Amino acid sequence: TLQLWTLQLAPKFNPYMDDVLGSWDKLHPEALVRWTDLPWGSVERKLLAAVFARTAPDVVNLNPPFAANLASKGGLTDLTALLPPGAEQNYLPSVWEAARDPEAGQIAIPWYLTVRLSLVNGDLLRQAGLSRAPRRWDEVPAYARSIRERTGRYGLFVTVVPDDSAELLESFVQMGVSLLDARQRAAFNTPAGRKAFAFWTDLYREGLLPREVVSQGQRRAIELYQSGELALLASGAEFLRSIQTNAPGVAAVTTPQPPLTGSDGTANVALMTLAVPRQSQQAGEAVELALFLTNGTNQARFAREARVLPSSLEALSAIRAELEVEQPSNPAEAQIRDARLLSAETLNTARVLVPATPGVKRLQSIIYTQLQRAMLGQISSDQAVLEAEQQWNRYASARWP
Ligand SMILES: [Zn+2]
Ligand SMILES: [Zn+2]
């Protein structure tokens, strides 16, 4: 009677669903969960089948910028009225607020989150003559020079594909660029924004970035790092554990380090939420399922198995204490432990730089497109800024007259 969709969920996290949905099913025999999985490659296939059956999920996972986009078309329920009293106080406030669309309300409930680190290939680093690894975007151009010229490998990968990861968009925010103002108008036509556009335009033209950044998404950065062809990757403990079995030695060479952060030192948080579509006649039961999946006990389980961080304050403090007591023996276990502590301790100064803001996902595709043209030599960086501003304000003028 309850439809649960997990969108683009790694198949490694599958045995957990059977363990939690097992708990829910014995706890609620009269409201069993029909789990539908939509991993990469079968998303279009599955969604379209659901369109042709006029069926929708009661609970589904989304990232904040994506939820706000779907909330703009009236597809998500505002949960503030369906929540029991005291629920919001179980979650990290900064994270709970990030799942709040300023124009639609609480459209989702926080689930797990990940503070991605800088996984540094210490081998390529020494091949280039370096001892430290960069920690502020200012230090990146020179680092990218050393790696590329003195070792023939690329120093970093950040996609510029309009519809993929926002890591690049996040870097703008870290470098002090404000994307939208109060009236939902463009706010990046500023000295800080022109520096950001040029920063990436220059890195690509200079040849210090892989040519594929404009044609392939962040999944190629993971392929390149596994191949020993990338010096730095933005990820964390769970991926690091996959390397220890797939392509080890690249793991024996990797060391987790604090993430590339702006001059204000705030790293990024990647938030996964749960939302309840408005076309649901069990919205109250759906919210009960979402609050169950995201309670302290289940979050603490998941944070361990998936090596992520929970949004529950209770589970968070439990994970921390479970790490401060951890005393590993293998140097691999200490590598994984070192990464989870880094993300945990970095969480204090970390924020969701791209929250559930309406139009921001659309703005991302506008910025990446004109940025592509800039780094491909068609236009300038200062010209890409203006063209992106004009093109966005043209849209905002009709969406928010
Ligand atoms: Zn509200
Ligand atoms: Zn991607």
Numbering used by the authors: 10 to 410
Task: Pull verbatim passages from the article behind this deposition.
We report the functional characterisation of a modified sugar-binding protein, MsBP, from a marine Synechococcus strain, MITS9220.
The structure of Zn-MsBP showed a single chain containing two Zn2+ atoms in the asymmetric unit (a.s.u). Notably, the structure of Zn-MsBP shows ten molecules of SO42−, possibly sequestered from the sulphate rich crystallisation condition (2 M (NH4)2SO4, 20% w/v PEG3350). One Zn2+ atom (Zn #1) appears at the periphery, weakly held within a negatively-charged cavity of the crystal lattice, created by the side chains of amino acids, such as D87 and T89, from two neighbouring monomers. The second Zn2+ atom (Zn #2) is located within the binding pocket of the protein. However, candidate sidechains in the vicinity include S174, Q227 and R228. The fourth coordination for this zinc may be satisfied with the carboxylate group of D173. This zinc is held peripheral to the binding cleft of the protein and is within 4 Å of the aromatic sidechain of W49, positioned over the binding cleft. Two sulphate ions are positioned in the positively-charged binding cleft: one adjacent to the bound Zn2+ (SO42− #9), and the second buried deeper within the cleft (SO42− #8). In Zn-MsBP, helix 2 is pushed ~ 10 Å over the binding cleft, attenuating access to the substrate-binding channel. The observed partial closure of the binding pocket for Zn-MsBP, caused by the movement of helix 2 exposes a hydrophobic patch to solvent, and positions W49 to occlude the entrance to the cleft, closely positioned to the bound Zn2+. Thus, from the ‘partially-closed’ conformation of the Zn-MsBP structure, it is inferred Zn2+ may modulate ligand binding, consistent with an induced-fit mechanism.
